[PDB]
Design a binder for this molecule. Structure first.
Ligand SMILES: [Mg+2]
Ligand SMILES: [Zn+2]
Ligand SMILES: [Zn+2]
Lengths: 1259, 298, 73
RNA sequence: GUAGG
């Protein structure tokens, strides 16, 4: 497996594939239920239905294989051969391929210079086309035919003159005879009127025939190839008048002849000529035409494949006609389409053998065209073949496309054996690598291993008896099972699996019941609630799979979340409450027996058991040797006249008993801690432990913390009751005062003194003030010993707004369709809302719920798009070859006389790599290629450095992918990234994970549409697709004088650049709210008005660095609005991916097209090649494009087809003949090969393991 | 869409009356005699042959005149017969086929209009098509008319009685037996698509709910392999000669077993010797010693 | 809101319209004095449509008998 | 189709 080349399939190849030829619509007999002869399912073309059984029965046994019986001709082999072998249908009248036409012009390609309507009215038998003309022959005999037509006109005029003479004679004769007769007064006048009416009619037909002669003559003078003759009567007239110099035809046959006689080389030359000197949209049309023509010219495949001649058929088992119980049947819809095409072809053949009219045969050929097209894709034209009438018919194309297509449901996401699922319950007695599996689940997962073990232990006599015993389920089987499951990892997994912590390995363990048991600490990483959930439990089998689950996917080696390098496996619901209750300042209860001095902790717990002491009370505690003192206690020490090293010996402190216990939980080497732990400080110390200790110790301390936290949370005694939540007493007074004020304003509105809109505006203001005031009063009232304050302050669970609306008035509630009411709710959930208050609360509740469902759909889609563009990048080099870097500000917002580190230094420069060394006082402070943590950054800012040159991926120059040195250190491991890691996929997952969590929207439009910029997730996608912003603000082109022209029709902005450059004029809406002064100096980068900048022009005018920094800043400020933080490397990967391509301009010497997308690498190679050749390099400009366009444009067709849009890409790849090499990830996942990312990489696969000679000597 | 274009293709053509149609038929027979004379191997004058050819061409033109005229009638009949499984437009084409057949077999000798003669052949062609290409599992014509007669008479029974008639009653009105009744009732069903919604708007297909049977169960396959190995082991435990003769008799190396005397050619023994050693082999293998390991296999 | 009666009325109306089309066709292809009420009609459309509504129709749903409250709601 | 996530 080295490539998958694809090209246009000619008729000869289709014949080669065929092992026969279909000649009937028959499938099976109605009474014998066996396949018929020479139709569909025929044994003689596809293969025997039963293993080695020929249809007649001449051969029925297995021994005599590889022979054909002369009775029915069936070849005896395995029935599975039917699944492969294919036949082919013949066509009496050629038809055209639907896919390559009736679409965008990037696949049709304008090969023949005709509008789509022309083809649509030729290849459906509605007009004529002139396939070929003897144009030279027509000019050779021009004088002769001209003379003949002149003679024809001469005799026409002579005959007409004779007709005039006869008419005049008749008129005179009848007039004379009737006036002589005198039958009535004026008979002569009446007959003369009749005669002149007859003359008029004869003249009318005379001019009509003259017209027909002149028009057929000028049409003859208007002969050329590729001319449509809509009027069939006209074409017939041409044919009767003249033949043997022009040939015309209808339907796909004319196109087939035209392509056969086509000369793509001459067309390519002409198109190059017009591209050299051409203007307008004609240049774009000639560009597309050149693109498609070049494709045929470069590739050996001939264009005649556009119009097929034989229709391939599927092997029958891919379209099974399975038998169902009850006498019914079942068939895939492809059978019906094949039957229709076969029937229509047969009837056309029958009608062609007998002399038949042109009308009927043309109609039948049109029907055949309609049928074959449906087979390629039903419903691409007119109305879809409905078949039974309740639904369309699934065609061939429909199986390769969409959510349910073959690509995205059967090559990427497959089903798998050795798996299970069940509800989950929390298990606190486990460790960080243990999970409980029910007996039945474990038994059914490990059945082969249990059977092998049973036979080895002699409980079971044989494999069959072992199977019988395990199915019976006797106690010996369960004992063997309990023996066998251990030291074997199982991968637990949850359904959404947003990020790579979704699948985690555990060591199993038997347990009664039927619900999995899981470790609480890891629950928050999955996002696994226990309301009611379910978790898949996959089982690795091979040695490699279990080894991987041991080393990589273990639940104990995934402390740090890769989004931002912070701990994720230390949840806080019930345990942080216990720890906070432990290390809490006094007043948490009545501090009984405080201030004493105790010999050691042991005496403290004995006193506590005695009940005199309280866990919260400041007392003096000694510590035996080996207890490291507090970090800040290092300077202070005891009082002595001799040197004393309290870093490692006895020392007395003032602290609480609970602080002593908490410190006892932590490792002995860890210094003391004497503050509240809460949620942030606990995360900080966990981060410190994960940084500075091996993994097993970290896990052990996490488990001790879990146990102690649960126990002390139980001891805490937090509750909720009627008296636990008390409304502030001051609420009623203040709210009634504000009600009085509101009533006064309502009264003064009743007199019309104030407008309704204004009244609503001030009510909003006053009630916002009132709700803020009551919130402050409630916050002041509640002590810190109240159960709720404990669980909200500690960081366990809850936010103060929920408390505000539980105990304080809920207040302003948005009305429907993003409006605000003037009368806020004046009650709390404790007090109890009223009816209309409940209704107007529901107004917002339902909208909130709807939003969440929609958000999941949008975030999921975004995450999918992100991965596909970013999949290719992989760290494929240990260290870079270059030195260029990227400048970052180390410390910003530096107050007067001091230096302050930036608030978000953690997500900007931490974990990067310093490319060049730094010297501020003549000495190195941060050595090169050393990461940036708290200590180094603190020292650097203390020295007073303002900016640094951090190495980063954008400037990284690596021949293969991107080196590890530039990428910095990963976040989930806390160490430099190993070679071959998939940084693209983790980047995309990190970007996409919080998309659900964004869940923010403009609270009120404010009555103006288009002013407020898109916010939240839409903004992000609007960022990541290069989409021009909804509210766009033009940017200054360059320095100069800017002024406003307020034309009545529409506002207008005009800036004349300085230095005499050309004046530049931009438009602007009437509602501007501009800020730049009129007739004033402007700078290059400044924006003209409020809105949102368009990335394209910033790239065009400023530079790639400007758009890069603007993009990362914009997305990061969007994200951190709610509070989510991600590192900048994740975004930088994608932002680098966007700009990889380039727009070639002035493609003169490069010889390829101008103004089309080009990979940067191929641009550089072509430029080097052409400058080496002596020709100048074609120019180029950076071009920012969305993630989607970029993914579709990827070189490998197979990966592109696996993306959302399939038909266009497959068609373009087919016409271009692009062989896809299997380098990449999404290309190799479908083939089932090893992804070249990490353990699958080459250098990591070709080692040999040998025991040492001394080891073999040891024995 | 396409049927609209075909009706347009019909467009406006001159309808036929008695005098016009009989004159056309006269030209038809004139041309038929002309081409008959042309086909004769006897030498004919060149100008005479061209005269015969042009009158034959004029007769062909008259033919197409009749067909283009009566397209409207045949599509009317197609409407009468459509909606029963086949496509409407295909029925129209089949009616056109019946029309060309009938006009090939019409003459003015009949003292009536076209509409009474052609319509019989149009009805014939449509009925044949509807009986031949309607059902996926094709039924033959005799059984097809059996099905339709049963269906219509059963509908008449429902209309009259208003209840489901007893099988014997239907058998009597049909005069067949109840066995043939259930047979024909089962023969008249229709396939149900595997791509049906399965009653679910999305994510489901009736084609992904029924398990196959060709697939080899790994459990049974490995059990068979262990059976083969254990039997071969116990077979080797016995004498190599006894082993070989039993193996060739029961065909443990090839699919087809060999007869007794069939073994007495390669091994050069008698048809009764081979029987004797086979018998004592069955006696030994019947011993409980070399049976236990084979008991669970059955 | 269309209640049950209106939906059933709409479906039986569609069935009876199909019946009218069929009987009009038959009348156009039937001889006078061979015409009776019991012969001209055909009961297939009406029963076909009413059964095609009561099965395989979104508004026709499976009763949920978890408890009487499920039934009511 | 409707429930639970
Ligand atoms: Mg949940
Ligand atoms: Zn055979
Ligand atoms: Zn690098």
């Amino acid at each position: 497996f080295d490539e998958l080349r694809i090209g246009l399939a000619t008729a000869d190849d289709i014949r080669q594939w065929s092992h026969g030829e279909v000649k009937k619509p028959e499938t099976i007999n109605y009474r014998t239920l066996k396949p018929e002869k020479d139709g569909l399912f025929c044994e003689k073309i596809f293969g025997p239905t039963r293993d080695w059984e020929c249809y007649c029965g001449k051969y029925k046994r297995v021994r005599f294989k590889g022979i054909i019986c002369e009775r029915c001709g069936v070849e005896v082999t395995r029935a599975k051969v039917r699944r492969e072998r294919m036949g082919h249908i013949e066509l009496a009248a050629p038809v055209t391929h639907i896919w390559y036409f009736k679409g965008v012009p990037s696949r049709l390609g304008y090969l023949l210079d005709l509008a789509p309507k022309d083809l649509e009215k030729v290849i459906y038998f509605a007009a004529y086309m002139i396939t070929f003309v003897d144009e030279e022959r027509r000019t050779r005999d021009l004088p002769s035919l001209e003379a003949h037509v002149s003679v024809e006109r001469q005799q026409i005029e002579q005959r007409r003159d004779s007709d005039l003479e006869a008419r005049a004679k008749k008129l005179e004769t009848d007039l004379a005879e009737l006036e002589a007769e005198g039958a009535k007064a004026d008979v002569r006048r009446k007959v003369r009127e009749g005669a002149e009416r007859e003359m008029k009619q004869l003249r009318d037909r005379a001019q009509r025939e003259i017209d027909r002669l002149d028009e057929v003559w000028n049409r003859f003078k208007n002969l050329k190839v590729q001319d449509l003759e809509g009027d069939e009567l006209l074409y017939r007239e041409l044919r009767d008048r003249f033949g043997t110099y022009f040939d015309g035809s209808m339907g796909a046959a004319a196109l087939q002849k035209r392509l056969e006689s086509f000369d793509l080389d001459e067309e390519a030359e002409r198109l190059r000529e017009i591209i050299r000197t051409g203007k307008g949209q004609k240049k774009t049309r000639a560009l597309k035409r050149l693109k498609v023509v070049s494709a045929f010219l470069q590739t050996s495949n001939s264009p005649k494949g556009m119009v097929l001649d034989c229709v391939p058929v599927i092997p029958p088992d891919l379209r099974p006609m399975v038998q169902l119980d009850g006498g019914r049947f079942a068939t895939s819809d492809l059978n019906d389409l094949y039957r229709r095409v076969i029937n229509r072809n047969n009837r056309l053949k029958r009608l062609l053998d007998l002399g038949a009219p042109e009308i009927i045969v043309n109609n039948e050929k049109r029907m055949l065209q309609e049928a074959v097209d449906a087979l390629f894709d039903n419903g691409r034209r007119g109305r879809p073949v409905t078949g039974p009438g309740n639904r369309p018919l699934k065609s061939l194309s429909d199986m390769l496309k969409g959510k349910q297509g073959r690509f995205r449901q059967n090559l990427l996401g497959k089903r798998v054996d050795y798996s299970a699922r069940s509800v989950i319950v929390v298990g606190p007695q486990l460790k960080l690598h243990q999970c409980g599996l029910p007996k039945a689940m474990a038994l059914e997962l490990f059945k082969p291993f249990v059977m092998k073990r049973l036979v080895d232990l002699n409980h079971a006599q044989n494999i069959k008896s072992a199977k019988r015993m395990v199915e019976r389920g006797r106690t010996v089987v369960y004992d063997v099972l309990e023996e066998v499951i251990a030291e074997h990892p199982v991968l637990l997994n949850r359904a959404p699996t947003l990020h790579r912590l979704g699948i985690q390995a555990f060591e199993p363990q038997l347990v009664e019941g039927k619900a999995i048991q899981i470790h609480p600490l890891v629950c928050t990483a999955f996002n696994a609630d226990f309301d009611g959930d379910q978790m898949a439990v996959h089982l690795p089998l091979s040695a490699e799979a279990q080894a991987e689950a041991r080393i990589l996917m273990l639940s104990s080696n995934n402390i740090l979340k890769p989004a931002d390098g912070r701990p994720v496996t230390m949840p806080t619901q019930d345990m942080v409450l216990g720890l906070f209750f432990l290390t809490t300042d006094s007043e948490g209860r009545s501090p009984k027996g405080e201030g004493r001095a105790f010999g050691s902790s042991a005496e403290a717990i004995m006193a506590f058991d005695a009940g005199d002491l309280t866990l919260q009370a400041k007392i003096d505690i000694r510590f035996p040797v080996g207890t490291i003192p507090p970090r800040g206690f290092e300077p202070p020490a005891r009082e002595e006249g001799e040197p004393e090293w309290q870093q490692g010996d006895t020392f007395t402190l003032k602290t609480t008993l609970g602080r002593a216990l908490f410190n006892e939980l932590l490792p002995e080497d860890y210094p003391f801690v004497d503050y509240e732990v809460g949620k942030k400080q606990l995360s900080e110390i966990v981060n410190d432990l994960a940084e500075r200790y091996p993994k097993v110790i970290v896990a052990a301390t996490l488990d001790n913390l879990k146990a102690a936290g649960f126990f002390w949370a139980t001891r805490s005694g937090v509750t909720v009751a009627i008296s636990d939540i008390v409304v502030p007493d001051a609420k009623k007074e203040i709210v009634k005062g504000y009600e009085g004020q509101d009533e006064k304003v309502q009264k003064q509105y009743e007199r019309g003194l104030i407008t309704k809109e204004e009244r609503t505006q001030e009510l909003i203001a006053i009630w916002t003030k009132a709700t803020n005031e009551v919130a402050e009063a409630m916050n002041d009232n509640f002590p810190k010993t109240n159960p709720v304050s404990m669980m909200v302050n500690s960081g366990a669970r809850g936010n103060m707004m929920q408390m505000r609306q539980i105990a304080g008035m809920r207040g302003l509630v948005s009305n429907a369709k993003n409006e605000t009411i003037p009368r806020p709710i004046k009650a709390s959930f404790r007090e109890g809302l009223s009816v209309l208050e409940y209704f107007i609360s529901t107004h917002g509740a339902r909208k909130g719920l709807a939003d969440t469902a929609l958000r999941t759909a949008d975030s999921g889609y975004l995450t999918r798009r992100l991965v596909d563009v970013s999949q290719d990048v992989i760290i494929r080099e240990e260290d870079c070859g270059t030195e260029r870097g990227l400048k970052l500000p180390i410390a910003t917002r530096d107050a007067d006389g001091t230096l302050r580190k930036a608030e978000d230094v953690e997500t900007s420069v931490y974990a990067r790599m310093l490319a060049e060394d730094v010297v501020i006082d003549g000495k190195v402070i941060a050595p090169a290629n050393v990461d940036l943590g708290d200590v180094l950054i603190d020292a650097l800012v203390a020295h007073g450095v303002e900016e640094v040159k951090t190495r980063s991926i954008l400037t990284c120059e690596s021949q293969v992918g991107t080196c590890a040195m530039c990428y910095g250190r990963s976040l989930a491991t806390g160490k430099l990234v190993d070679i071959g890691e998939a940084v693209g996929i983790i980047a995309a997952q990190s970007i996409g994970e919080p998309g659900t969590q964004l869940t923010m929207r403009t609270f009120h439009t404010g009555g103006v549409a288009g002013d407020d910029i898109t916010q939240g997730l839409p903004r992000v996608v609007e960022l990541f697709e290069a989409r021009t912003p909804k509210g766009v603000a033009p940017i200054s082109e360059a320095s100069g004088r800017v002024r406003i022209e307020e034309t009545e029709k529409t506002k207008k902005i005009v800036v004349t650049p300085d230095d005499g450059s050309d004046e530049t004029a931009f438009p602007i809406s009437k509602r501007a709210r501009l800020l730049v002064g009129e007739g004033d100096h402007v700078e290059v980068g400044q924006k003209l008005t409020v809105g949102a900048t368009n990335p394209h022009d910033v790239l065009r005018i400023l530079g790639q660095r400007a758009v890069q920094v603007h993009l990362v800043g914009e997305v990061q400020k969007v994200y951190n609005s709610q509070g989510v933080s991600i590192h900048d490397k994740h975004i930088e990967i994608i932002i680098r991916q966007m700009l990889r391509r380039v727009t070639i301009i002035e493609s003169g010497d490069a010889e390829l097209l101008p103004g089309e997308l080009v990979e940067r690498t191929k641009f550089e190679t072509e430029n080097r090649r052409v400058v080496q050749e002596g020709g100048h390099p074609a120019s180029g400009r950076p071009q920012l494009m969305g993630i989607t366009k970029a993914s579709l444009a990827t070189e490998s067709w197979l990966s592109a087809a696996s993306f959302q849009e399939t038909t266009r890409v497959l068609t373009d790849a087919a016409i271009n003949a692009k062989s896809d090499s299997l380098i990449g990830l999404k290309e190799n996942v479908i083939i089932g090969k090893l992804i070249p990312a990490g353990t699958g990489l080459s250098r990591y696969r070709n080692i040999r393991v040998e025991p040492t000679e001394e080891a073999k000597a040891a024995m | 869409d396409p049927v609209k274009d075909y009706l347009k293709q019909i467009g406006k053509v001159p309808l036929l009356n008695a005098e016009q149609e009989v004159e056309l038929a006269k030209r038809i027979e004139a041309g038929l005699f002309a081409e008959d004379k042309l086909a004769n191997s006897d030498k004919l004058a060149p100008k005479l042959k061209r005269e015969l050819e042009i009158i034959a061409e004029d007769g062909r033109r008259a033919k197409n005149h009749l067909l283009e005229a009566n397209l409207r009638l045949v599509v009317s009949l197609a409407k009468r017969y459509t909606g029963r499984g086949m496509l409407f437009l295909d029925l129209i084409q089949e009616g056109n086929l019946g029309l060309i057949r009938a006009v090939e077999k019409f003459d003015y000798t009949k003292g009536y209009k076209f509409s009474t003669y052609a319509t019989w052949w149009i009805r014939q062609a449509i009925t044949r098509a509807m009986a031949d290409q309607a059902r996926t599992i094709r039924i033959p014509v005799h059984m097809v008319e059996v099905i339709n007669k049963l269906a219509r008479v059963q509908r008449q029974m429902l209309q009259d009685l208003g209840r489901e008639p007893t099988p014997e009653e239907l058998a009597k009105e049909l005069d067949m037996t109840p066995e043939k009744v259930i047979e024909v009732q089962k023969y008249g069903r229709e396939p149900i698509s595997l791509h049906t919604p399965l009653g679910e708007d999305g994510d489901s297909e009736f084609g992904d709910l029924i398990e196959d049977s060709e697939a080899v169960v790994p459990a049974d396959a490995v059990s068979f392999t262990l059976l083969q190995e254990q039997l071969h082991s116990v077979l080797d435990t016995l004498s190599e000669r006894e082993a070989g003769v039993v193996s060739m008799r029961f065909g443990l190396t090839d699919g087809q077993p060999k007869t007794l005397d069939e073994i007495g050619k390669v091994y050069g023994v008698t048809r009764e010797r081979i029987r004797q050693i086979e018998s004592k082999t069955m006696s030994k293998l019947r011993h409980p010693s070399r049976s236990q390991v084979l008991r669970d296999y059955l | 809101i269309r209640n049950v009666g209106e939906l059933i009325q709409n479906q039986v109306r569609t069935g009876l319209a199909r019946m009218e089309r069929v009987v009009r066709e038959r009348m156009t292809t039937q001889d006078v004095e061979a015409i009776t009420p019991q012969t001209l009609i055909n009961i297939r459309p009406v029963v076909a449509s009413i059964k095609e509504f009561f099965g395989t129709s979104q508004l026709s749903q499976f009763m949920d008998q978890n408890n009487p409250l499920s039934g009511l709601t």
